[PDB]
Design a protein around this ligand. Structure first.
Ligand code: BYW
Ligand code: MG
Ligand code: MG
Ligand code: MG
Ligand code: MG
Ligand code: MG
Ligand code: ZN
Length: 889
């Protein structure tokens, strides 16, 4: 297995200037003819001409219209086409080929494939070589002239990149369309779509050049009524890039296409963005509330790539975070501005500190710019995306909005139309840094360590107040644990957004301040501080670190009630919960280990419970924020703080804490559940697919969170409310009614009721599957077998497989059954899926990422299943390399 190394980058000895394709789709095969107009580069040293080409059936290959002969002049091993150098011209030449591929049976969903009745491509990262021969790497920029032909009745809509410059009829009921795309692009941005697509369209007029842009959103005919929100989101995305960054769309048309079978969320092919249907299609009758934020962020994300990824592209794949981290950051700015809810930023932090922090303390830990790879299909990680986004966001925190925008424009103007590297972005930010500091000696050299250093920094604090001097000191320390990528970890440039809260009146004591920690430790002193403050640390979550605030629970309660920053309030609550969890966990663990017949548990802090009540009863407080404060931290956040975590003991710990708080607040919860109904479930705009109210959706989140707490608590007669909830028109509500009925004898009645409501919409049925999968049922293993036999069957749709199994793996008590039967079940699914879709098989490995953090018995059980999977003779390259890294083999 070849290992590619970042330091080994070298430009190709060849140039591809023009790609001319004819893609002829037939019933049993697709014929791809390609002419490459090529040249010899200045780096050429007379090497063989080697093309990437995977799984291609060669009809012929030619150079300058002379047919080449296998064996004497070229070899092909189903991976690399080698033309021996004595037959390679020494000046401009044409290479041509005709190959046969088979999209109908391409169940790995890479290259050219068939999703239901739509022919569709997915070429990032190295999938273009599955369509035709190429030097398949993003620095090989070329012009593209693409003709597609197909049966007209089956495939009336034909799409590719660029302008449609001809449409024509063909004998035998066929037709063709020619697309010319003159701007240079890398081959991973090529795309083609053919199908019986229906659409919605609009015209957007750009802000400055006043150019008309045609916007088209496409789906199969059955779901065309679910396209309107995506179209609205596209218009919003275009306006945000104009308003915040001054950036306008450059092309005459932008197409968005939904397909049912897709490995990820969506893909930014130039002018032809292709989406998992679950990230483009929604309607209020057939989608849960989460769909609306998902579509907004994914449409936005693919649109923002037109600059950060498409117009400025990548020199090589080790620069992936340059487009993905930066585009996620742009997506998050956009989403925060559109939703106008503090929970948007909180949701991103919550994902980072659970899923990404787990990755970064796992054997899979890597920097956002790795040093090596074997499989590109495994490279697309929450580290590269979400830690990358936080590294991109930290520049905005350091520079402020005005100077950030200045540096960003420098990046765009200098690199537009070219490949780029992470250093090009740091350089642009550094220019803005020198301007902000008014110091041409200032630099961001240390900042580059965010790209090369793996692991999560730990930042800890000590404080001093001198009441006579009115002098306050914050002593800060940073530490990153050594790992397999760096034995010695260097201090990073850590920006710490801080406030100082006056504990007597809750007011700010200083102006906005961002401490620049550049050493292993530093002391920040503040004069004229009239009273001892409570510090508000890492406001907005200003660096991707473990925060150790060294605050008392009394101080954290004051921040939770009175601080101005949503994250610090949320984090103070998180930290209070974590202290309680660790304490009760150890108490339960000791009672288990010592086989005690009686023992004590330390109760939940009464003043903390009072503060939760205070915030819940505040009419002016935010409903989304309220739903966070009544929820314990995620299990995958908790596990970063416990060695040899016994999942049963943790489940007992959470159960005790939830019961402690509910024993005091359940009447409050019930009162709010009833009083929130009017606004949360208001039907005024139910039939307006353009009207989306994120505050109202957060009210439903709060109601459904409270109903869950009350149902688990067996609150008197709460089953009455569950049954009435099941009659709500909103799928978020009636699906919640299914999950919370798990604790009652009506569960299977609601199972059948909600199945009937879901089964005729493909995406709604997948949401139903997820709801069943995560149901807190003692008979969940029997229920999953029922799902397999009656609904899932042998579907190869990744959305179906992921819906049935991934939510269940988050069932702390049942997935981690001490028998190991949950580990066995998911391992069987991974191996089955690996036969046809290695990338999705590796996604299904997610539960195993924490294997070496569990108690020694569960470590052994997980390791056995992972070694069993590794022994499968037919294991894919993707899955083998992933499990070898994960098991430290
Ligand atoms: C899940 C998330 C982050 O929401 C998302 O959808 N991310 C997008 C994105 O980055 N869009 O811009 C994306 C697009 C394509 C791939 C990909 C697909 C393949 F078939 C490959 F073989 C491969 F190597 C990579 C991976 C992620
Ligand atoms: Mg083949
Ligand atoms: Mg505008
Ligand atoms: Mg996102
Ligand atoms: Mg289906
Ligand atoms: Mg290792
Ligand atoms: Zn992306």
């Amino acid at each position: 297995p070849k290992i590619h190394y970042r330091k080994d980058y070298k430009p190709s000895g060849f140039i591809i200037n023009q790609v001319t394709l004819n893609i002829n789709i037939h019933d049993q095969e697709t014929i791809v003819r390609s002419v490459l107009d090529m040249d010899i580069s200045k780096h050429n040293v007379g090497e063989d001409l080697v093309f990437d080409g995977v799984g291609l059936k060669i009809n012929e290959i030619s150079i300058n219209n002379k047919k080449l002969v296998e064996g004497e002049e070229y070899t092909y091993d189903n991976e690399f086409l080698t033309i021996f150098s004595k037959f390679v011209p020494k000046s401009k030449f044409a290479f041509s080929s005709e190959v046969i591929i088979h999209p109908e049976t391409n169940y790995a969903l890479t290259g050219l494939y068939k999703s239901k009745n739509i022919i569709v491509s997915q070429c990032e990262a190295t999938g273009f070589r599955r369509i035709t021969f190429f030097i398949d790497r993003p620095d090989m920029m070329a012009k593209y002239d693409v003709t597609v032909t197909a049966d007209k009745e089956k495939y009336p809509v034909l799409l590719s990149n660029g302008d449609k410059v001809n449409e024509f009829e063909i004998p035998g009921g066929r037709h063709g369309a020619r697309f010319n795309d003159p701007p240079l692009k890398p081959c991973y941005l090529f795309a083609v779509v053919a199908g019986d697509l229906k659409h919605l369209s609009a015209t957007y007029i750009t802000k400055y050049t006043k150019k008309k842009v045609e916007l088209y959103v496409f789906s199969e005919e059955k779901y065309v009524s679910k396209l309107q929100w995506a179209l609205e989101c596209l218009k919003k995305s275009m306006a945000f890039d104009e308003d915040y960054f001054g950036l306008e769309y450059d092309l005459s048309r932008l197409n968005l296409v939904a397909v049912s079978d897709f490995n990820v969320g969506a893909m930014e092919n130039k002018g032809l963005n292709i989406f998992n249907a679950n990230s483009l299609l929604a309607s209020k009758k057939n989608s849960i509330d989460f769909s609306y934020a998902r579509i907004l962020t994914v449409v936005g994300h693919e649109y923002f790539h037109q600059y950060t990824g498409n117009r400025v592209t990548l020199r090589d794949w080790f620069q992936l975070t340059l487009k993905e981290g930066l585009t996620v950051h742009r997506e998050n700015l956009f989403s925060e501005e559109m939703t106008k809810t503090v929970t948007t930023r909180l949701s991103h932090v919550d994902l980072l500190r659970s899923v990404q922090f787990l990755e970064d303390s796992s054997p899979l830990s890597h920097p956002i710019r790795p040093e090596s790879y074997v499989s590109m299909e495994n490279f697309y990680t929450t580290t590269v995306y979400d830690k990358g986004s936080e590294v991109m966001r930290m520049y905005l925190t350091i520079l402020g909005e005005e100077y950030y925008k200045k540096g960003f424009d420098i990046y765009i103007k200098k690199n537009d139309g070219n490949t780029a590297t992470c250093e090009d972005f740091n350089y642009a930010m550094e220019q803005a840094y020198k301007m902000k500091k008014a110091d041409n000696s200032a630099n961001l050299n240390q900042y580059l360590l965010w790209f090369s250093q793996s692991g999560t920094p730990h930042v800890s604090f000590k404080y001093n107040y001198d009441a006579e001097k009115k002098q306050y000191s914050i002593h800060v320390n940073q530490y990153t644990k050594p790992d397999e990528n760096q034995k010695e970890k260097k201090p990073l440039f850590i920006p710490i957004s801080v406030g100082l809260i006056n504990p007597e009146n809750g007011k700010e004591m200083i102006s906005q301040t961002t401490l620049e920690l550049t050493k292993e430790s530093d002391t920040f002193v503040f004069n004229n501080i009239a009273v001892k403050p409570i510090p508000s640390l890492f406001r907005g979550f200003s660096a991707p670190v473990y925060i150790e605030d060294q605050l008392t629970d009394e101080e954290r309660i004051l921040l939770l009630k009175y601080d101005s920053d949503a994250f610090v309030r949320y984090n103070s609550c998180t930290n209070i919960y974590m202290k309680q969890i660790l304490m009760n966990y150890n108490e339960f663990l000791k009672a288990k280990n010592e086989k005690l017949e009686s023992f004590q548990l330390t109760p939940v802090n009464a003043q903390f419970i009072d503060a939760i009540k205070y915030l819940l009863e505040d009419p002016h407080a935010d409903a989304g924020f309220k739903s966070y404060i009544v929820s314990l931290p995620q299990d995958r956040y908790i596990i970063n703080f416990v060695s040899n975590l016994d999942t049963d003991v943790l489940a007992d710990t959470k159960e005790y804490i939830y019961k402690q708080i509910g024993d005091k607040l359940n009447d409050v919860y019930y009162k709010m559940f009833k009083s929130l109904e009017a606004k949360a479930d208001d039907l005024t705009y139910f039939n307006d697919e353009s009207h989306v109210d994120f505050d109202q959706m957060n009210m439903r989140t709060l109601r459904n969170t409270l109903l869950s707490l009350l149902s688990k608590a067996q609150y008197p007669n709460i089953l009455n409310e569950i049954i009435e909830h099941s009659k709500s028109p909103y799928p978020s509500n009636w699906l919640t009614s299914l999950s919370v009925s798990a604790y009652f004898d009506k569960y299977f009645e609601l199972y059948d009721k909600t199945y009937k409501l879901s089964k005729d919409d493909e995406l709604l049925l997948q949401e139903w599957l997820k709801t069943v999968s995560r149901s807190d049922r003692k008979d969940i293993y029997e229920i999953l077998k029922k799902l397999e036999n009656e609904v899932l069957k042998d579907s190869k749709n990744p959305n179906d497989i992921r819906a049935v199994y991934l939510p269940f793996t988050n069932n702390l008590r049942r997935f981690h059954d001490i028998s190991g039967k949950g580990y066995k079940l998911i391992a069987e699914v991974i191996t089955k899926t690996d036969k046809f879709n290695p990338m999705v098989a590796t996604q299904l490995c997610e539960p195993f990422k924490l294997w070496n953090k569990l108690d020694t018995k569960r470590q052994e059980l997980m390791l056995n299943e992972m070694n069993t999977m590794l022994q499968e003779p037919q294991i894919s390259n993707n899955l083998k390399e992933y499990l070898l890294r994960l098991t430290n083999k």
